[PDB]
Subunit: 347 residues, 4 copies
Amino acid sequence: SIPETQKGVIFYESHGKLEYKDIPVPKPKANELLINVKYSGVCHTDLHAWHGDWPLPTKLPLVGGHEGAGVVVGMGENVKGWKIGDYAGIKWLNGSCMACEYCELGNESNCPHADLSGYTHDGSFQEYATADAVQAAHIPQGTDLAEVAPVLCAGITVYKALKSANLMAGHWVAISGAAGGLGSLAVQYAKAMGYRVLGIDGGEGKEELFRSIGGEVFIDFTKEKDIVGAVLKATDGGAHGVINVSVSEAAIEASTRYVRANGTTVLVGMPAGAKCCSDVFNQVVKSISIVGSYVGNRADTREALDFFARGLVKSPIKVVGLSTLPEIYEKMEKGQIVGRYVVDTSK
Amino acid sequence: SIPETQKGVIFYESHGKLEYKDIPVPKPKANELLINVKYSGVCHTDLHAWHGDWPLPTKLPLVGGHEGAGVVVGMGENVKGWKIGDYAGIKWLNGSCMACEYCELGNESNCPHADLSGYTHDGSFQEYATADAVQAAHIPQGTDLAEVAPVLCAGITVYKALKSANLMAGHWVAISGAAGGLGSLAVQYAKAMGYRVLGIDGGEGKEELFRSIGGEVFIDFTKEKDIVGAVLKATDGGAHGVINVSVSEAAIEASTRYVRANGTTVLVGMPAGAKCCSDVFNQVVKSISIVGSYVGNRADTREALDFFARGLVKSPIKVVGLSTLPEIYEKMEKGQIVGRYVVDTSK
Amino acid sequence: SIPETQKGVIFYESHGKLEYKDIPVPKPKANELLINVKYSGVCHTDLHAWHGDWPLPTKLPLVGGHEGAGVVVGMGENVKGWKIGDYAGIKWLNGSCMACEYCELGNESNCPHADLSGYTHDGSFQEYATADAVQAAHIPQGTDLAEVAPVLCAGITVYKALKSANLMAGHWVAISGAAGGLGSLAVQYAKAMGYRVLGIDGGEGKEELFRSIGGEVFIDFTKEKDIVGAVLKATDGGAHGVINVSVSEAAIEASTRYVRANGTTVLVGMPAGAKCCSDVFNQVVKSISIVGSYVGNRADTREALDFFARGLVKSPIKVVGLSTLPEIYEKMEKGQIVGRYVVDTSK
Amino acid sequence: SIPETQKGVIFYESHGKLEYKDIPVPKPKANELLINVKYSGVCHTDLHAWHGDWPLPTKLPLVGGHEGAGVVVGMGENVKGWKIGDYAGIKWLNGSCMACEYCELGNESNCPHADLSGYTHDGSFQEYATADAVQAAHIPQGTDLAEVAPVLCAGITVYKALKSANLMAGHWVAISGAAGGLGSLAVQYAKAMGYRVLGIDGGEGKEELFRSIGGEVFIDFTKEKDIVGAVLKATDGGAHGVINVSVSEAAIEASTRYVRANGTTVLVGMPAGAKCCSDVFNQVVKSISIVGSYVGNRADTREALDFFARGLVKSPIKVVGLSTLPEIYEKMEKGQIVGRYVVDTSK
Ligand SMILES: NC(=O)c1ccc[n+]([C@@H]2O[C@H](COP(=O)([O-])OP(=O)(O)OC[C@H]3O[C@@H](n4cnc5c(N)ncnc54)[C@H](O)[C@@H]3O)[C@@H](O)[C@H]2O)c1
Ligand SMILES: NC(=O)c1ccc[n+]([C@@H]2O[C@H](COP(=O)([O-])OP(=O)(O)OC[C@H]3O[C@@H](n4cnc5c(N)ncnc54)[C@H](O)[C@@H]3O)[C@@H](O)[C@H]2O)c1
Ligand SMILES: NC(=O)c1ccc[n+]([C@@H]2O[C@H](COP(=O)([O-])OP(=O)(O)OC[C@H]3O[C@@H](n4cnc5c(N)ncnc54)[C@H](O)[C@@H]3O)[C@@H](O)[C@H]2O)c1
Ligand SMILES: NC(=O)c1ccc[n+]([C@@H]2O[C@H](COP(=O)([O-])OP(=O)(O)OC[C@H]3O[C@@H](n4cnc5c(N)ncnc54)[C@H](O)[C@@H]3O)[C@@H](O)[C@H]2O)c1
Ligand SMILES: [Zn+2]
Ligand SMILES: [Zn+2]
Ligand SMILES: [Zn+2]
Ligand SMILES: [Zn+2]
Ligand SMILES: [Zn+2]
Ligand SMILES: [Zn+2]
Ligand SMILES: [Zn+2]
Ligand SMILES: [Zn+2]
């Protein structure tokens, strides 16, 4: 059944030309498993991977995409817990070494041999892609794969962020950039986890979408000038935890000021070489923690997909065929991502 | 017995002239209690208070000192748990409002009405000083008050820092500035708490004193150039938690790079208007937390004084009379603090 | 304005006769504050206090009630943070010594000098009652005092329990006794905190009320025989955290078996001298934690009253006059508490 | 080099006769790896496995032993992170499914498909034994394998226990049964982690050995009658965390009474069908947590072996040949284990 060739967009030279062609099927190593990828999201990480600008060297030739979702067609002889026909998800972190120290502690994303899907491994921009049998996401049966694709890297990231913010149910969380592709999932996850969301975003239709997905207070970062004072006024003391999913370094810097004392400031957005210069005196006096957060581990994956299965979170996807993926990249690096451009592999 | 006047160094105008004179005894408010201060430490915080440069306005006239230790002579009618003749310690945070939200959570140092001793309240540079009956430190009987004076603001600070670093016994902690007045207490507390200390300091005799108080690995920040690589080599991956007690902003910036992934970087030293510009990408990818830490709360006070009572920590004090306190300040802002200039009130 | 006498139900001899009479006003000690109690709840704790059967000796003569809510008429000279006319709540733990070790750590309810309201202090069954200025609850203005009365000991208890269960949003919590006076508030707080509630109760109308206040799965402990298997079937592995608000020791014992491995079993209900004999082998192998939980501290008080202010939790109170309080006790020790018999002080 | 047969003690029928004979070499599955076991400890768990009395059915025929340590001779094709000639340790939990929910969270010991070494898998009582490449312990090179054998199940267990006790450096920990084979390692680990050890044991030479390995206070459970009062007197309020490594159910019951309020009581010893009947009222009022603790996970393994590598913990082993293993079992079920009967495989 597995066709000896599949369709996919691959590129050989970094920042080169996305060639939609046919490629042999990756065979599943004894530990890996093959996935007939049905849909796949796209995010800034795929741009950075195709650029090659990030410090780690991208394994070329490379088929991109780290937010893939599909059905298992063939597993490795060593695999257990998986069955054929199951719904699996190729996350960003493809496979870790399961033998260092971070792999053991749970933070698998920092393994010095972290095989990154779509960066150092065949990504999720093909009809069939291989992925580690342990790190793959157990997408529950019957789920709408196209709808769940963005949750696999975006939703998991914001969920691990919120868990890293050290918030208690009823506290104030400020999603700096709540209308964005990450911000909307962050707001939904925060409202589901019991926090009180305070979005900070601006532009056209942003506040409307934010009210739609459910948010207590909205702060337009274009109309309101003193954002810090506005947040301190709304939350009455500062947000108990901020999530910097925005891309403006200025917004990150301003985030370390409207966070309540003893609060937390999760850094998630990774703008182009920015610095989080917080006033060391103001940070010490108020004991403000500025935590970073990479893609979540397996437990976070399971819990985020659980939150999705209960219909709590929703992603306004825009299904698009795979053949036009180069045009998708072109509009992406120009900033045309409106909701979330989930790609379709069959098309 | 309480003399209607006591000796003390007071100053009326910020950055003015330290007048050693006689002052009426502060009467203990129903909640406060009076303390015949026997000894008192000095630290950069007292310099900043006498300057007035810090944002909060210093209550003038002001008798300085926030690291005082003495014997209770008279308590307020409302006070309970205290007895006359007990050994009490005037910490930095004199009295909080015990009715807001941070006071309740335990982080009393952030109360918007935090009465700061020696900054907004009569400090510990007098024969007799009043202090809150709740925040005062319960110095155990028989303790050498002169020896315990530095533990009251320095030791408590580094202990709350180490507790904030989220380390487990056996991890690697890098005390950036281990030979300093804060660094030595930090190293002793870390070794007592089970961590593996890695000091980062330099100068004359620093490494010798560091080996004396007990430290695994020392890194001279003047001879060694690539500090980051050196720490990564010694700790084999990065220190599980860094404590930035140094005053060089450059050292703080370099600290966010030799901290192990998923580690922590407690900011304690408050240099003159510095910025902790950490590479947001490197901080996110490795999930490095940069936590701040102010003076510890009451529980930290009790635990740190307990560590001192078991003879685990030691402070190389230099007892000096109170009369020469202006000269002490003069040599201090010139940088003549060698070990820790603990002052004597009687002298 | 303060009348030199007020109405109240007092009793002199333990398990004696509840005399509704007039009593002089308690004067507020410099640390305490007076409260014109407007309403007050009742719970099994008041029965146990009136019996005197509990080990601690009840201060006689004693006016009962530990769930009082009223308006501040006069505060002590030492009090700060409070204003006249504010809405305050007399919780169970009236005043702690704020000088021992548990008081410092936050667990004030275990202070060896814990002044227990209605047990060792003048309770909340009078028109005017005094209460500690620190431990009193800051009931927000405009709140319906009669509605908030049960939240002051019941709601706070179940909230501290759920926080002690160590659950993450999306986990399974089994409120053993969900329909009871404590169980309903527990279910509401759990649903608000993001958990997935699984009630275990039975009787008449219980499941209907449980569906009303919002609960995923209900297990009738009278119709269903194998409760353990039923819970394991519903939660698919065991509830991530159980809350034993029931009074049947058998139910507590059965609770240590349907809790998921690595889960938790908060003990809250205090039946008449029961034992939690859990199979030590089964508890070890599955690493099941059986945590206890007394009344919450000040932070829990603030957070629970916050959850109430957002209209998330609701208590089906039954306002009853104070004059009939003896009949209330009589019907109580016979088991006639239907919803929650909140008493009215004016009536 | 791998001999087609090796020596080993195997038994076919539960509670049967230990036959020392020759057995074919287990071949390493693609995920497993073979280990030329050099030494191996023995503990009550091996008795229970040979009995078959434990609920899980023991895979027969079965070679016992779960505390093995040896050198890797041949790894599976899929294995990464391991090299030939490395020092590996066969712990109790041989291999988990790494695909359920507990495996993901880190608590691998509760996987419903937890392959238990020496219970459901070929144990460590043979010259060569296979073990999972992930769960195997990375014994550092040059370590004295005979000395490290007991640390592989005993030391890891007590370390995970102490970590589960939720203690802070400087607190009081009561090792109920400090002189025993588990108690001695517990005391050493506690002293290394910074806690203040208070042993509770009795018999001949017990207190002497306890003073030897380093313990603050010792309580003879045979001479002293009121153990609870004695511990409350020594620790001044109750031990902040108790570790019930003893086998007397009476001692476990007595443990839930001398634990300080808000403390913890780790259950580790698994006596023959015992019950931890704690007074539910006393447990609630003091909020005493009774946590269980099975064998630690991989992170605990690494940290415990690290504590061993720094020479902090030591096990008084008694090297004995493998041929006499049946006599070892016979003396064991009669209670002749004096220190720790580490077996030698070559002999
Ligand atoms: N850490 C991870 O694992 C991970 C994974 C995926 C994406 N990311 C990061 O997510 C970001 C992209 O998120 P997205 O898809 O929502 O991007 P987007 O560009 O689609 O949306 C960004 C949002 O930021 C808002 N914004 C812009 N300037 C702002 C300001 N000054 N203050 C507040 N909000 C402001 C915009 O209005 C918009 O709502 C990138 O930084 C990317 O690297 C991180
Ligand atoms: N947060 C608080 O509650 C609190 C309280 C008291 C003091 N402090 C802070 O403590 C600091 C003073 O500490 P101290 O008394 O030890 O000061 P100190 O000047 O006596 O010693 C500072 C130490 O830093 C070392 N150092 C200098 N440059 C360094 C570099 N580049 N890298 C590493 N180490 C370097 C020095 O050699 C010395 O050992 C100040 O920042 C002060 O504000 C904070
Ligand atoms: N720890 C504290 O701070 C604190 C404070 C207040 C009350 N409490 C405890 O709360 C309890 C009273 O709660 P309440 O007011 O809801 O009591 P209640 O008697 O009004 O209700 C008890 C509930 O338990 C249910 N139940 C009975 N048998 C059961 C069984 N076998 N399994 C499951 N559920 C069963 C009943 O149907 C009912 O829903 C008492 O134990 C009291 O001491 C504790
Ligand atoms: N949970 C796990 O992963 C795990 C692993 C291995 C062993 N264990 C358990 O460890 C226990 C064996 O430990 P050991 O090897 O030290 O056993 P042992 O029999 O060699 O020593 C037991 C100790 O308990 C002491 N003791 C006896 N009665 C006591 C009492 N009333 N109060 C206090 N102390 C008392 C004895 O004097 C002795 O010091 C068994 O329960 C076993 O199942 C658990
Ligand atoms: Zn790894
Ligand atoms: Zn993504
Ligand atoms: Zn306050
Ligand atoms: Zn100081
Ligand atoms: Zn107290
Ligand atoms: Zn109550
Ligand atoms: Zn599993
Ligand atoms: Zn063992």
